[PDB]
Design a protein around this ligand. Structure first.
Ligand SMILES: [Cl-]
Ligand SMILES: [Cl-]
Ligand SMILES: [Cl-]
Ligand SMILES: [Cl-]
Ligand SMILES: [Mg+2]
Ligand SMILES: [Mg+2]
Ligand SMILES: [Mg+2]
Ligand SMILES: [Mg+2]
Ligand SMILES: [Mg+2]
Ligand SMILES: [Mg+2]
Ligand SMILES: [Mg+2]
Ligand SMILES: [Mg+2]
Ligand SMILES: [Mg+2]
Ligand SMILES: [Mg+2]
Ligand SMILES: [Mg+2]
Ligand SMILES: [Mg+2]
Ligand SMILES: [Mg+2]
Ligand SMILES: [Mg+2]
Ligand SMILES: [Mg+2]
Ligand SMILES: [Mg+2]
Ligand code: NA
Ligand code: NA
Ligand code: NA
Ligand code: NA
Ligand code: NA
Ligand code: NA
Ligand code: NA
Ligand code: NA
Ligand code: NA
Ligand SMILES: [Sr+2]
Ligand SMILES: [Sr+2]
Ligand SMILES: [Sr+2]
Ligand SMILES: [Sr+2]
Ligand SMILES: [Sr+2]
Ligand SMILES: [Sr+2]
Ligand SMILES: [Sr+2]
Ligand SMILES: [Sr+2]
Ligand SMILES: [Sr+2]
Ligand SMILES: [Sr+2]
Ligand SMILES: [Sr+2]
Ligand SMILES: [Sr+2]
Ligand SMILES: [Sr+2]
Ligand SMILES: [Sr+2]
Ligand SMILES: [Sr+2]
Ligand SMILES: [Sr+2]
Ligand SMILES: [Sr+2]
Ligand SMILES: [Sr+2]
Ligand SMILES: [Sr+2]
Ligand SMILES: [Sr+2]
Ligand SMILES: [Sr+2]
Ligand SMILES: [Sr+2]
Ligand SMILES: [Sr+2]
Ligand SMILES: [Sr+2]
Ligand SMILES: [Sr+2]
Ligand SMILES: [Sr+2]
Ligand SMILES: [Sr+2]
Lengths: 196, 145, 115
RNA sequence: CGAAGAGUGCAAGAGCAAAAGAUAGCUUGACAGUGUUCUUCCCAACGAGGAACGCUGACGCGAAAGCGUGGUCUAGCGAAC
RNA sequence: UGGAGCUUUACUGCAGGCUGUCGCUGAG
RNA sequence: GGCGCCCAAAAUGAUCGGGACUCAAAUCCACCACCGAGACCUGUCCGUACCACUCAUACUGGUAAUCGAGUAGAUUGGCGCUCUAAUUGGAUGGAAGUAGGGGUGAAAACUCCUAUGGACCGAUUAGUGACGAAAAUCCUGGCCAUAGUAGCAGCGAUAGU
RNA sequence: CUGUGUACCAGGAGGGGAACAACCCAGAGAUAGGUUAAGGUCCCCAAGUGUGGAUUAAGUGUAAUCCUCUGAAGGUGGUCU
RNA sequence: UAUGCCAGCUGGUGGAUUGCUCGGCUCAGGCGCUGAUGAAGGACGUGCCAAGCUGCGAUAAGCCAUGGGGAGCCGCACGGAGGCGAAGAACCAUGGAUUUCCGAAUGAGAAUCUCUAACAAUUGCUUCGCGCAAUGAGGAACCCCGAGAACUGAAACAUCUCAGUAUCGGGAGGAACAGAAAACGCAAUGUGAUGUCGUUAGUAACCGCGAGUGAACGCGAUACAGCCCAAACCGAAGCCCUCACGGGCAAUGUGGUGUCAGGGCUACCUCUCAUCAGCCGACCGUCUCGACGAAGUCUCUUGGAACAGAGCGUGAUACAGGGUGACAACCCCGUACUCGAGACCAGUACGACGUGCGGUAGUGCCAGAGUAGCGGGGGUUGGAUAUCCCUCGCGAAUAACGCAGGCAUCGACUGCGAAGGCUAAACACAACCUGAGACCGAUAGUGAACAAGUAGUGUGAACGAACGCUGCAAAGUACCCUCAGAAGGGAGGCGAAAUAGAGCAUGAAAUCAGUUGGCGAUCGAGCGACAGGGCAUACAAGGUCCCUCGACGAAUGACCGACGCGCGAGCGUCCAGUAAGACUCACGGGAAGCCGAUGUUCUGUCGUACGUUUUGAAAAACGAGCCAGGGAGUGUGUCUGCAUGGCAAGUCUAACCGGAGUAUCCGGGGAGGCACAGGGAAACCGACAUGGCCGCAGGGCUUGCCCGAGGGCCGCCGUCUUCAAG
């Protein structure tokens, strides 16, 4: 009802004015009127979702999984590491780590920490997003895929995303649709992922 | 770039004279208005035809062509092999919410088949037997008199 | 404007072949694959059976489906096979991708285009 | 003597002479079913209506070929409920 | 194939009046 | 037979566009030389279409005497604006904006310099749209000419010095 | 006013026609040199005050087309052949 | 050169723009009644100074208690004076006190006051006394019960449609309503209370059979829960008030029994664990609130300020977000982890007390009447003969009976007992709390970021704006001069900046003052485009340009001379396709307002705006004074193409369920839809996995000859109509 709360009417012909609805001498309601209604505004009724055939989606999760095993693709996507073998597989005991820094040492030992150095640099976006709480954005880095629980130890690492093998999704494996994220699976997670 | 996107600047957005895209007059009436007068062309002609029998006195048969049964014999390894024997009722989907299962004679029967159904067509029999096969009506199929 | 990167490379390959080797079927198949998807072929086994002959690779400028029966020992090359077509075919012959066909037969000889 | 100026139900234009006219006799095809084609609507979509031309049925007249799907042709017509 | 006011033996209806009938409603 | 003459009167100022012209600067019959378009010819470039090569609609080469105007309308590529994501950059050694000026692009537009400003701003790709104005007696706000103009006289109450 | 065929205007530039939707040339990417078209060559205004010859004295005329440019019936020892 | 034109410069005006957000908008989760114990709302008061707002109520921006909290405080609101606070104030949670008048407004009256003990009025109980109680009115919408349009669509219009919508009357709650079959009728050896969601389905049905309207059963889910009377047989064995005494009720029936697994009675069997009444009474989960809570404020440079650059270092179950003199995980709040509290779930679940389930035989003892049903007239509905309801009239049976199963009657069959009643959960809404956002960002977004329903308009119903930004810190301008002067001005002071000095960040255009460049008082009007001159020009972001000569040289293309024609103007042949020929380049010389470019002006060619209407617009046809900002293809459902993508004789899940990183996402769900066979009104019947010939592409071959998918022309097949045929 915005802009419609007024009994404003149009004098019609007779007083040398355009036939615009006025009230108390001010034009109202119509779209070309200051304070007037919005002609074709955003609507609640609009369906803002997107359907995706399950097969087409599952094929995407598998295709994203594959992108993970291609160091060249991974390097292309932007990640900064120094290995040749990827994904990076780790002992199930990784799931038992508790301290964040225990994971840093392991990543440095694996020559994968550089990517975190990459994400350790937030960006202050241009635009009003900031007025709505979107002042920052940062690069996406390592995704840790365990199987029992998301690694609480790794999650706080700059740009790090933690996920579990049974529900790791396309967005996890390819942030923003960009294939080849630098992943690190848990031996057990690696196996479960085989059947997705 | 889409058509819509290219419209800014065009004034009439493709409607021709700006005296065109107004109300329902430009459509010759709302909805099907004029379906028997000005916009009469290509419209089912006005009328009332036939009748309908009550839905709970109607029968929906489930049908299948020999061709479908035949093309899948070997594949139906879970359905008897003798001198193949198949109980159609266990093949045709939609057989539950159906009054009866009927075998139609569309296609070729390249095997000796012993078919069990509630009903067959003249041509369905001719083909099954012509291949050294047999046809057997179910007990329900006994309602053929 | 094809969106699939693979279908896009396959087409570039078919061309490279038809141009370099003695191909023409390959350039003919690339021609059709460049047209919109509704024109691409959707062929069931029954048709491949009715017109194929041994020692003559069947080339489907599209996707092979699984209705009907195939008894002939023929090698079928196609953009894709349904899970069932590939299975029913392998039982009596061989299902290969056009990427392979262009690989073994860049001259595109002794072949039969089926749609 | 006389190709047609007569006559042929009615406008007009057209058709017709061992006839499409006249007379006589006989007869009910002014029939049933179902189509093709054209027309209506040049070209170029559109209904009812119309016409020419088939196939099937049953008939009339005739020696028979054949003629008769109304009056020689073009007006005399009407949707759904 | 706009609007309104008015008219009438325009079309269609609605009040109102008259009239029959049933109920109220009974005994010889 | 050729040219002319009479027939032959209209309203603000006459006319062959005007000046003006008489062996013509008129008319007719022949002729001679010139002026004059975006047409036609010619050089280079652009677009478009087609060809060759090619993954390419990227280069490169080739063909167009038989391509190059356009309202309504159909089709296609591209410019710019908001916010989201991914990738990746700039800013107090001065961001955005604004003013004046330089460069590029057929163009939508892009970009730099100087001043101002004093804190935010992009690019690529994929999205998202309350996405582009010279016009509607369009809306709201602001502002100029009108103009130092009209009114500050008229009434039975002329009011003052 | 109402048909028909066609080219044009509409939606067609540029050159000419004093001006001037549809009359003449002309159908047109940018830029450049050149040669023409229609139409012009006394001046205004690019090019002739060109050539051979005739007629006209009315300023006839210097007005292709035209709503737009009038000139008729009737007459003429005006003048030339 | 005056008056003046165009552009710029300096300064105004103006407030666009950019940046910022204390407000909106939308979605999600939670929670949800108030009032005669006088509500909601309103009036009027109330502060040291007090107008507005907020709060409060004569105890009046407050009083008391418990807990929290803490060295400060006295609201918005940055003043002055004064006061309070370690007797622990402020502030917060919970609980309590006070709580003027009008207001349902209730002693009577009244524009917020007055007049002489008051439940006014209507009721129930009743000690028949207002003694004890009830109703009234409010609430964002939701919900239930009634009354009920028209514009509109049908391209007119009356039925129909809009629509049982808008609106009106009455009423309840936190949710309402519905609900334990006189059901269904995939007809059955079947289902088994009711909502709701998905589907069934735009199907059945309706309909100037036009436009249009439009279910259900079932299925998949959500949540699940069944009971109580009347009567029979008993017959005061009973209920209410009161401490009691005592009173009231009740044979016109309180109370027991019982309620279609029919019941009762008589006679037996067995048993309790059903139900119903009542006691105790959560876990978990969800929402909100709160406690605790790691690690740099190191160096150098720049800066007014370091959160910047460079260097060194650190935490992280914490790299969400905000603050802080500029980009901050480590300066401050907070965030992760862990914990606590209240609320809701819920007086529910479980547990437990009492009760007693059920079964056999006999028994025509009981089982809801203006009903069932029929007719007259209407309304409503998809309800068509077959919806539901109102009104007038008529009108039954008694379980051995009655109703239903989509026309009526009779029989059979199957289902079920109407004319009494209650009933949790799953579903609606959004006042209120909290959270969230590809939403807007101050002409937007609410009408409202400000005084917002404010100022203001109307007798009234009602209507209704506009106003955001100093600075890091007020350091918010002392002293001096001038002046009629707490004005204004000059000078000065602060600050990085006063061109940050009060609607005080930035500061566009229109436009104004002054001024610079060009033109300018003998001259002509779509204001320009293109080309060429004058005059003008700090740098930067452009660096070219002119003249000799020379090279290259397309189309085109000579003078002169010689010869030969023509009455003549002039032409022909040769010289010669030569000289010349746009552009481009090289040598040599030159220009620095010099070349481009920009401003203005002059000359030449063309030229009567722009948008619209129109056959025809400069138009004496329409629109606008100018500028900035604002200002028009959007959503849902269905249908039909198309491009791309997945899967393919199949394909997709919907509601919803589980998980989790909790609106995303992973898994599950195939109910159902479309496709897999059609033709026929219906009954009913039911098809080419290829038989022939042409032949494009492509393949083969010994280079016209074969194979030829797709395609083309036929055959034949299913069905409808059919004496056949067509
Ligand atoms: Cl097929
Ligand atoms: Cl472009
Ligand atoms: Cl050049
Ligand atoms: Cl549009
Ligand atoms: Mg608005
Ligand atoms: Mg911005
Ligand atoms: Mg229409
Ligand atoms: Mg009228
Ligand atoms: Mg990128
Ligand atoms: Mg705008
Ligand atoms: Mg004046
Ligand atoms: Mg036109
Ligand atoms: Mg001259
Ligand atoms: Mg004259
Ligand atoms: Mg209508
Ligand atoms: Mg309900
Ligand atoms: Mg009609
Ligand atoms: Mg039903
Ligand atoms: Mg506003
Ligand atoms: Mg300011
Ligand atoms: Na309002
Ligand atoms: Na929606
Ligand atoms: Na009137
Ligand atoms: Na609440
Ligand atoms: Na009383
Ligand atoms: Na107009
Ligand atoms: Na115009
Ligand atoms: Na005019
Ligand atoms: Na004005
Ligand atoms: Sr008028
Ligand atoms: Sr309208
Ligand atoms: Sr009709
Ligand atoms: Sr099913
Ligand atoms: Sr005839
Ligand atoms: Sr063009
Ligand atoms: Sr064109
Ligand atoms: Sr053309
Ligand atoms: Sr807009
Ligand atoms: Sr003024
Ligand atoms: Sr006076
Ligand atoms: Sr006066
Ligand atoms: Sr001269
Ligand atoms: Sr002369
Ligand atoms: Sr002469
Ligand atoms: Sr005229
Ligand atoms: Sr004339
Ligand atoms: Sr004459
Ligand atoms: Sr249940
Ligand atoms: Sr009963
Ligand atoms: Sr019946
Ligand atoms: Sr404003
Ligand atoms: Sr009034
Ligand atoms: Sr000063
Ligand atoms: Sr040359
Ligand atoms: Sr699926
Ligand atoms: Sr065929």
């Amino acid at each position: 009802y915005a802009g419609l709360r007024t009994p404003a009417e149009s004098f019609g012909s007779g007083r040398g004015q355009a036939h615009v609805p006025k009230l108390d001498g001010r034009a109202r309601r119509v779209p070309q009127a200051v304070k007037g209604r919005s002609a074709h505004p955003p609507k609640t009724e609009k369906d803002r979702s997107l359907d995706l055939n399950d097969k087409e989606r599952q094929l995407a999760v598998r295709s994203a999984l594959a992108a993970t095993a291609d160091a060249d693709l991974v390097a292309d996507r932007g990640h900064e590491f120094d290995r040749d073998e990827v994904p990076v597989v780790v002992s199930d005991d990784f799931e038992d780590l508790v301290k964040t820094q225990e994971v840093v040492s392991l990543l440095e030992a694996l020559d994968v920490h550089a990517d975190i150095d990459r994400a350790d640099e937030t960006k202050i976006k241009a635009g009003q997003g900031s007025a709505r709480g979107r002042k920052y954005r940062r690069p996406a880095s390592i995704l840790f895929v365990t199987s029992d629980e998301p690694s609480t130890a790794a999650r706080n690492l700059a740009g790090a995303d933690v996920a579990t093998a049974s529900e790791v999704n396309t967005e996890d494996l390819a942030p923003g649709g960009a294939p080849g994220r630098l992943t690190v699976f848990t031996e057990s997670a690696l196996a479960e992922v085989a059947e997705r | 770039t889409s058509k819509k996107k290219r419209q800014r600047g065009s004034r009439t957005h493709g409607g021709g004279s700006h005296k065109n895209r107004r109300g329902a007059g430009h459509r010759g009436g709302r909805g099907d208005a004029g379906r028997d007068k000005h916009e009469f062309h290509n419209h089912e002609p006005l009328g009332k035809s036939g009748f309908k029998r009550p839905q709970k006195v109607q029968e929906e048969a489930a049908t299948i062509d020999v061709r479908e049964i035949d093309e899948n014999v070997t594949l139906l390894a879970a359905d008897d092999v003798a001198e193949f024997r198949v109980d159609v009722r266990d093949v045709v989907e939609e057989a539950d919410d159906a009054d009866y299962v009927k075998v139609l004679g569309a296609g070729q029967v390249r095997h000796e088949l012993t078919l069990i159904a509630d009903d067959f067509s003249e041509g369905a029999r001719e083909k099954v037997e012509g291949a050294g096969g047999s046809v057997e009506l179910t007990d329900l199929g006994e309602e053929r008199q | 404007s094809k969106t699939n990167p693979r279908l896009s490379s396959l087409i570039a390959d078919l061309k490279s072949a038809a141009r370099s080797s003695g191909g023409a079927v390959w350039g003919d198949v690339a021609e059709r694959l460049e047209k919109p998807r509704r024109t691409h072929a959707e062929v069931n086994l029954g048709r491949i059976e009715r017109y194929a002959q041994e020692d003559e690779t069947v080339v489907v400028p599209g996707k092979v489906l699984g209705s009907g029966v195939l008894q002939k020992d023929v090698t079928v090359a196609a953009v894709d096979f349904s899970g069932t077509a590939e299975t029913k075919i392998d039982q009596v012959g061989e299902a290969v991708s056009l990427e392979q066909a262009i690989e073994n037969n860049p001259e595109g000889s002794h072949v039969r285009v089926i749609r």
